[PDB]
């Protein structure tokens, strides 16, 4: 299918990014789009047989190219805080049928010192809910992270579990009056009361954080907020 690279990316003002998109095999047209809140989906440009065949209303710093394998790049020179968006990529045979990819999530930051890895913490079920409902609910708190590049997953006994999982749609702004506010995400894993009260069962809340890469410098006193997995585990209790 359609593949977009990278999935998450962070850059400061004035710099540039290059997003890649490999279309479906046999397809020759690649359309680029920008998805912002308040403006919706906006057409960038379309490439066909390694030339830009169609264009939108974006300024000149929005450019791109296409290669012999129908694969396309798009480049955004002089980044801007308003350029933060999800950059989608539509693949087409040429004109009929457009298949979008997963998209590249770009977040432009004023300075890299505003990026923070999440602090993950699990909370064991309450005996009050075990006696009343014969069920047990765990809560995971990933707090104090910026930007919104976070993937939360539950793991039981080494295997990822989706049944009984209930995660918040969007994170919670710890400073609702700020634009560079730290975020907080919550999720729940409800299992049977006999399952949690089994001390042999292992529970883990994994939060994949997408942050800085090795190509980025760090001059702060804390650790570099690199792309990392932050987790918290808890065994059962009898």
């Amino acid at each position: 299918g359609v593949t977009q690279t990278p999935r998450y990316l962070i850059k400061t003002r004035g710099q540039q990014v290059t997003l890649s998109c490999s279309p479906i095999s046999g397809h020759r047209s690649v359309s680029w789009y920008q998805q912002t809140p308040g403006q919706g989906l906006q057409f960038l440009f379309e490439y066909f047989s390694e030339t830009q065949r169609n264009k939108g209303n974006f300024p000149g710093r929005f450019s791109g190219r296409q290669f012999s394998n129908s694969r396309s790049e798009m480049n955004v020179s002089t980044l801007e805080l308003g350029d933060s968006a999800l950059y989608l990529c539509a693949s087409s045979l040429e004109r009929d049928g457009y298949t979008f990819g997963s998209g590249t999530r770009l977040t432009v930051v004023e300075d890299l010192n505003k990026v923070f890895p999440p602090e993950v913490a699990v909370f064991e079920p309450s005996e009050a809910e075990i006696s009343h409902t014969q069920k047990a609910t765990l809560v995971c708190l990933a707090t104090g992270f910026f930007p919104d590049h976070v993937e939360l997953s539950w793991w039981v006994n080494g295997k990822e579990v989706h049944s009984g999982v209930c995660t918040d749609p969007q994170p919670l702004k710890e400073q609702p009056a700020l634009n560079d506010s730290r975020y907080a995400l919550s999720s729940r894993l409800r299992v049977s009361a006999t399952f949690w009260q089994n001390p042999r069962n292992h529970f883990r809340c994994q939060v994949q954080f997408y942050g800085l890469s090795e190509n980025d410098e760090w001059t702060q006193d804390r650790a570099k907020p690199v792309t990392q997995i932050v987790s918290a585990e808890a065994w059962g209790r009898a």
């Binding site: 989706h162 049944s163 209930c166 995660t167 918040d168 919550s186 729940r188």
Partner: peptide
């Protein structure tokens, strides 16, 4: 005091379909 909203169940979930909110 931070309060979440109604969580959305996992798309691949097959058990324990109950809405839950969290405050801390």
């Amino acid at each position: 005091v931070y309060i979440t909203d109604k969580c959305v169940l996992d798309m691949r979930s097959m058990d324990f379909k109950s809405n839950s909110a969290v405050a801390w």
